[PDB]
Symmetry: C2
Subunit: 197 residues, 2 copies
């Protein structure tokens, strides 16, 4: 046997989880916000089921200076991977609605940790996915509680929800406003937008 | 004014630094080793002036579980950036002579911290550089103590030392053994190997 890390397809699943327990989970979602202060470091994620950003809030807790540095070094690499630029080390980080500019697919491993009906997600790993890859995985193609299609299914859903936000006028999200709108993204979008017939 | 982060071109510079001081530094070097246990996390870097790996040892100290996680998440992103694959979270990290396989250019900001003639380097930031970029920067092209040519000069030196190790037979380092030997690397190598005339 193993840890039996549970795959969650939605923050709504947390509503039926144990009330005092530590449960390892994994979920796929777009990075939507970063907040780095001196006492706190917060990562927002959304899946965009109907939409609303930061459904998942993952916490990187820290008390010391060393902790504080580690948290900062972590944020720094995550932003570099996704080409999100940061102020200079030698110069507080606040990033909101990241998805309006970038589209940062991420596979996360967290610890759902709950007490008295309240729960917190602590990060254990994060795998940034390349938009390049994500598009392949969709165009193209451990524990007993994660199917090797869950991740894939998630990526597919995220992108559909993304499509329905693009159409919707009262939504600030639009494929064109993305800093990285290639022609591949265009045609990918168009293809998936044709999988309705 | 600013922090006056000092650019160091060599670990040999540390021999003339203050004996009880905290001095912010920056240096460019290839990642050569990673060690992750439960009490310690160590990053080895080399510049390869004549050669020897791990001239620079940067320490990511940690006492808690949270710290321990942060350190791990940090290592994980660094390896992903450089396409170094790691065992599964749900399954101690020991990576040596990374440069025989990969070539991982890195710009680091550390705190030289010394007491009684002894010094330690604590990480504050690390910028992985893409081999793709590094080759441009060389083929192609803040504080008062870092010139905007230092980084560049360093990259150039590293690669020359690399060339002289390739020639040398008693050295296990060879361009061909690299997991990523493109044709660009070939021709880049050949060009720089022609800048001797």
């Amino acid at each position: 046997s193993h840890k039996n890390r549970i795959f969650v397809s939605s923050s709504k699943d947390f509503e039926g989880y144990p009330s005092k327990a530590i449960v390892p989970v994994q979920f796929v979602a777009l990075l939507t916000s970063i907040h780095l202060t001196e006492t706190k470091c917060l990562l927002g994620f959304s899946n965009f089921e109907r939409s609303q950003e930061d459904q998942y809030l993952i916490k990187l807790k820290f008390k010391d200076r060393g902790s504080e540095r580690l948290a900062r070094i972590t944020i720094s690499l995550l932003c570099q991977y996704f080409d999100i630029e940061l102020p200079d080390l030698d110069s507080t980080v606040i990033l909101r609605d990241i998805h309006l500019e970038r589209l940062c697919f991420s596979s996360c491993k967290a610890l759902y940790v709950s007490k008295h009906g309240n729960y917190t997600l602590f990060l254990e790993d994060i795998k940034p996915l390349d938009l390049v890859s994500v598009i392949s995985t969709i165009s193209t193609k451990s524990s007993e509680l994660i199917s090797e299609c869950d991740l894939n299914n998630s990526l597919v859903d995220i992108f559909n929800n993304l499509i329905e936000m693009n159409r919707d006028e009262k939504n600030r999200f639009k494929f064109v406003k993305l800093i990285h709108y290639d022609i591949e993204l265009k045609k990918f979008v168009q293809d998936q937008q044709k999988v309705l017939s």
